């Protein structure tokens, strides 16, 4: 199984490399060659979830058989027996093993600095270039630093 | 199964490449060569959902057999027994494995900037060029940036 773990590491590294390639394909025309640096971290879960759900519909029952005895005298006896049929959904789901659980991307732009408007524009391009998903916990940093 | 995961990555990359090709086929005449850059992120779910639904119709029962005893004297006894037949739908669905769960497209247009009207027109063309589906969670960014 350790060979499987090794190949999982290979998958994660391949994903990171592909994302880096896309980042380059976007930023190389916009910024130029050597005016930026970017690295990508991709964390992938490899669990084996397998779920079975059996759901009913309480608010729409359908009476199948029914008995109702109601006699008076004073005495009032109200017996009743009822059998129901209910909407039944049975869903069996099997999640894919390797899923990107969190994605971190950081891009540093060489100074000569960059204005806030262009930094936010680059961030907007990257959002969509990488597939930024904040609800997944992903993080995207864009900074303007001084290259040596 | 890790080979299957590798081929799933290949499928996702192929989808992204096809969408990029369509984006180019639309924008190359409109904008020109080298006046734009665009990248596409496609996230695909590969679950194995398999659902079985059994639904009834509570509001239209059909009486199959019926017994009704109603005697008086004062004393009033009202016995009743009833059997019903109901509309029964049984649907077994099996979803396709790989489905595009979210799609992100970002396009950056070289300045010399672009007016808001033409930006929105390009966005309208892309909506339909790519098959934008906001209800799916898809995202489409169109920006006017300064190429270096």
């Amino acid at each position: 199984a350790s060979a499987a773990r090794r190949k999982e590491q290979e998958l994660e590294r391949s994903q990171e490399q592909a994302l880096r390639e896309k980042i380059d394909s976007v930023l190389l025309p916009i910024l130029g060659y050597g005016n930026y640096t970017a690295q990508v971290d991709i964390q992938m879960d490899f669990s084996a979830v397998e779920q079975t759900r059996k759901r009913f519909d309480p608010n729409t029952p359908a009476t199948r058989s029914e008995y109702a005895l109601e006699d008076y005298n004073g005495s009032v006896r109200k017996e009743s027996t009822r059998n129901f049929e209910l909407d039944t959904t049975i869903s069996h789901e099997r999640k894919q093993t390797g899923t990107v659980a969190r994605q971190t991307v950081s891009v540093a732009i060489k100074d000569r600095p960059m204005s806030e408007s262009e930094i936010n524009a680059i961030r907007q391009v990257l959002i969509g270039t990488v597939g930024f998903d904040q609800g997944r916990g992903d993080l995207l940093n864009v900074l303007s630093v001084k290259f040596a | 199964a890790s080979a299957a995961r590798r081929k799933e990555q290949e499928l996702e990359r192929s989808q992204e490449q096809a969408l990029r090709e369509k984006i180019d086929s639309v924008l190359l005449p409109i904008l020109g060569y080298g006046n734009y850059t665009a990248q596409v992120d496609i996230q695909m779910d590969f679950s194995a959902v398999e659902q079985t639904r059994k639904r009834f119709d509570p509001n239209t029962p059909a009486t199959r057999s019926e017994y009704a005893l109603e005697d008086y004297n004062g004393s009033v006894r009202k016995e009743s027994t009833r059997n019903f037949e109901l509309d029964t739908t049984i649907s077994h669905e099996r979803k396709q494995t790989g489905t595009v769960a979210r799609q992100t497209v970002s396009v950056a247009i070289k300045d010399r900037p672009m007016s808001e009207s033409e930006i929105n027109a390009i966005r309208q063309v892309l909506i339909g060029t790519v098959g934008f589906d906001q209800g799916r969670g898809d995202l489409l960014n169109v920006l006017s940036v300064k190429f270096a």
């Binding site: 199948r64 058989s65 008995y67 027996t81 009822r82 059998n83 129901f84 049929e85 | 027994t81 059997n83």
Partner: peptide, 12 residues
């Protein structure tokens, strides 16, 4: 009565 119900108990 119809014990048809997979959980029919009323029976009677």
């Amino acid at each position: 009565g119809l014990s048809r119900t997979d959980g029919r108990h009323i029976p009677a």
